[PDB]
Amino acid sequence: MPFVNKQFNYKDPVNGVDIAYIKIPNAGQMQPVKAFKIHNKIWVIPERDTFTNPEEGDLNPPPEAKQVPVSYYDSTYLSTDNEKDNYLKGVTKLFERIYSTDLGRMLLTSIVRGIPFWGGSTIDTELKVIDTNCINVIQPDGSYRSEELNLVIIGPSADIIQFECKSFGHEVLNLTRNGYGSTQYIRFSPDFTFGFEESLEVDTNPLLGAGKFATDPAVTLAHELIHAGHRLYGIAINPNRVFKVNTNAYYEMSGLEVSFEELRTFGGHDAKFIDSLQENEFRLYYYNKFKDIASTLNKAKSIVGTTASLQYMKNVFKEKYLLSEDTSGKFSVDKLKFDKLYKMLTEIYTEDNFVKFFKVLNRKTYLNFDKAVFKINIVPKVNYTIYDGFNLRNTNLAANFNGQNTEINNMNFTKLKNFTGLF
Amino acid sequence: RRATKM
Ligand SMILES: [Zn+2]
């Protein structure tokens, strides 16, 4: 069975359930936007993201001598219904490609179960949802109803290639780092991809290569989904914790520091830059956070609202955090179970492992240099499929990653900008 | 995040 049971068309009439006009909790004003619920707890908004951050509502590019090297602007991208239809279909197709692998099925299952914790109440004797982990859906009668959700895929903001995982913060709680979790908004586009070089010495050099091979967009989305997994379970590493790259002369002369959260997400050898001691520090830190959630759950006596029963919610979080329950019914965190879950989310779900499952060529490290951005169209089956990506079986593109070779499969890629030599 | 500033 498919991850997305319905093949939505952007123009399909709204129904107030899985096709509806919605508003997000940006703590500001906005006109409702058309959205599609593609799976339990997951929505797609085919719009440029001018909502999550009020200071980023301008899609227009600054003057030429003001733009960052690695960036791409086009204020008109994703403004027409045809584009939105293709965006919806492209994102859906990538979710299917990801779900078709055992690793992808595992990651998506973890994401759906990762409901943001109900820790919004001010009194420890009752559990209450945090409204910023919900969206407001316009019902058939014109009224709004609050719906909890775990993930939203939305178009990029001004800089089209700056894909990232975003979420609304709390006045006092660090939701992505206190075990609670929060609704994740992933800025992403299936309509562009990036080039990389097949030789490591070239890919990690800022002056060489034009970007001969194209990254499979399913890997790019998986990368953001991995971050979402960490953030939904509240175990993301503080961005202030970074690796002062000293293994790349070019990075060094720029004094560039890369966050541990990114190295962990890529996995492979990159993850090894995080030493054992710091690794243990974080593990214990989050163990203590899961413990506090257990203590808060015990002090809870009632539930706020009538959408679900306390028994239901207390159990939903017992399954999310895989807690244990004694005779009296008190909750506790088990070391073996915590370590297993923590390891699954941080070591099993990595970019490097997804590359193995998709059988594609990909950058070998996160510590490299971008080469170029290409326009693509993965919707037509003659171009890309759920099962083979660009490397179509029984064609000349089947072997040696020929489908990702932009020189061989040139009809599937239009280079929009070169980054090499501009750093 | 897709990549560093590089
Ligand atoms: Zn990232």
Residue numbers in the entry:
A (entry chain A): 1 to 423
B (entry chain B): 197 to 202
The publication says:
Seven antigenically distinct botulinum neurotoxins are produced by the bacterium Clostridium botulinum and they share considerable sequence homology, and structural and functional similarity. They are produced as inactive single chains of molecular mass 150 kDa and released as active dichains, a heavy chain (HC, 100 kDa) and a light chain (LC, 50 kDa) held together by an interchain disulfide bond. HC comprising two distinct domains is responsible for binding to neuronal cells and translocation into cytosol. LC is the catalytic domain cleaving one of the three proteins forming the SNARE complex (Soluble N-ethylmaleimide-sensitive fusion protein attachment protein receptors) required for docking and fusion of vesicles containing neurotransmitters to target cells. Catalytic domains of BoNTs are zinc proteases and cleave SNARE proteins with stringent substrate specificity though they share significant sequence similarity. BoNT/A and BoNT/E cleave the synaptosomal-associated 25 kDa protein (SNAP-25) while BoNT/B, /D, /F, and /G cleave the vesicle-associated membrane protein (VAMP).
In addition, we are also reporting the crystal structure of RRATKM, a variant of the substrate peptide, in complex with the enzyme. The crystal structure of Balc424 with a substrate analog RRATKM has been determined to 1.6Å resolution. The final refined model contains 423 residues of protease, 6 residues of substrate analog peptide, two sulfate ions, one zinc ion and 375 waters. The substrate analog could be modeled unambiguously in the residual map (Fo-Fc). Except for some minor variations of side chain orientations, the hexapetide RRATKM binds similar to the substrate peptide QRATKM. As in the case of QRATKM, the P1 (Arg197) amino group and the carbonyl oxygen chelate the catalytic zinc and the nucleophilic water has been replaced. P1-P5′ residues occupy identical subsites as in QRATKM. The only difference between QRATKM and RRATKM is at P1 residue. While P1-Gln197 makes a hydrogen bond with Glu164, P1-Arg197 makes a salt bridge interaction with Glu164 thus making it more strongly bound. The IC50 of QRATKM and RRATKM are 133 and 95 µM, respectively.
